[PDB]
Amino acid sequence: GTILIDLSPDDKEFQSVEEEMQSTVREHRDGGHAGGIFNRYNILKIQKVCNKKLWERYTHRRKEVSEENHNHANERMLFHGSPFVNAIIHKGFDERHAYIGGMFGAGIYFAENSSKSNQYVYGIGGGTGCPVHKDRSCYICHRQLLFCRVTLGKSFLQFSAMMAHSPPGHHSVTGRPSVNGLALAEYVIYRGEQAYPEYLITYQIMRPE
Numbered sequence: 371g372t373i374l375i376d377l378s379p380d381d382k383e384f385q386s387v388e389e390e391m392q393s394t395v396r397e398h399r400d401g402g403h404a405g406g407i408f409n410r411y412n413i414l415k416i417q418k419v420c421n422k423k424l425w426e427r428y429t430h431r432r433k434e435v436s437e438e439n440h441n442h443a444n445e446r447m448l449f450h451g452s453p454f455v456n457a458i459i460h461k462g463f464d465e466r467h468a469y470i471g472g473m474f475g476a477g478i479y480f481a482e483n484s485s486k487s488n489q490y491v492y493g494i495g496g497g498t499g500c501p502v503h504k505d506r507s508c509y510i511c512h513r514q515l516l517f518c519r520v521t522l523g524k525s526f527l528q529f530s531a532m533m534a535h536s537p538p539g540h541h542s543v544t545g546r547p548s549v550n551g552l553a554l555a556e557y558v559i560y561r562g563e564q565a566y567p568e569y570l571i572t573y574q575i576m577r578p579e
């Protein structure tokens with residue numbers, strides 16, 4: 371059901387998506403352990419993901435959340451990295467994409483910092499790094515992240531010192547770092563229908579000069 375349309379680097383759409391990737395890189399407290407060492411990406415391809423059935427599943431849930439709020443979907447564009455990105459684009463998000471061990475509960479996690487999502491491309495904590503070289507800081511192998519449309523509705527704010535249900539009357543959780551003043555938020559949803567994988571971004575991290 372899914373089809374991928376390649377965006378031209380000359381298209382303003384490709385260029386705004388690239389800008390959101392590049393401008394939300396930050397340094398990580400693990401010194402690059404999980405995601406590698408870099409300040410910016412080499413973007414190789416940006417594809418728009420088109421699936422009628424998944425889109426209708428998304429907009430159907432969105433209208434429901436919308437109505438339970440002050441007519442407010444609270445829709446964001448957020449990053450998601452995972453070994454399962456090729457499966458998500460075909461069958462959608464579900465409970466098997468849930469982070470059982472997550473600090474904000476057993477749901478699906480999205481990030482404002484693209485570099486936070488980059489830490490999960492090869493698994494929790496970066497797994498063992500790329501398949502070919504077993505290198506979490508690999509500058510050669512091609513990586514992929516999703517840039518997703520996410521319905522937050524009434525989000526429960528949880529300050530952080532850095533499939534389950536949302537707290538009563540809430541549609542998601544906001545995990546907001548309170549120690550690192552440069553770290554942006556993560557968000558957790560507990561229903562797969564609350565996210566749509568809009569763009570598939572293929573890239574390399576760049577070795578600093």
Ligand SMILES: Cc1cc(=O)[nH]c2cc(-c3ccc(N)cc3Cl)ccc12
Pocket residue numbers: 449450451452453466467468469470479480481486487488490491492493494556
């Ligand atoms: C915080 C966060 C951001 C993100 O962009 N992606 C994630 C993915 C996982 C996750 C969950 C289950 C499994 N099996 C694998 C993986 Cl990589 C967790 C956490 C995140």
Ligand SMILES: [Zn+2]
Pocket residue numbers: 500501502503504505508509510511
């Ligand atoms: Zn590699």
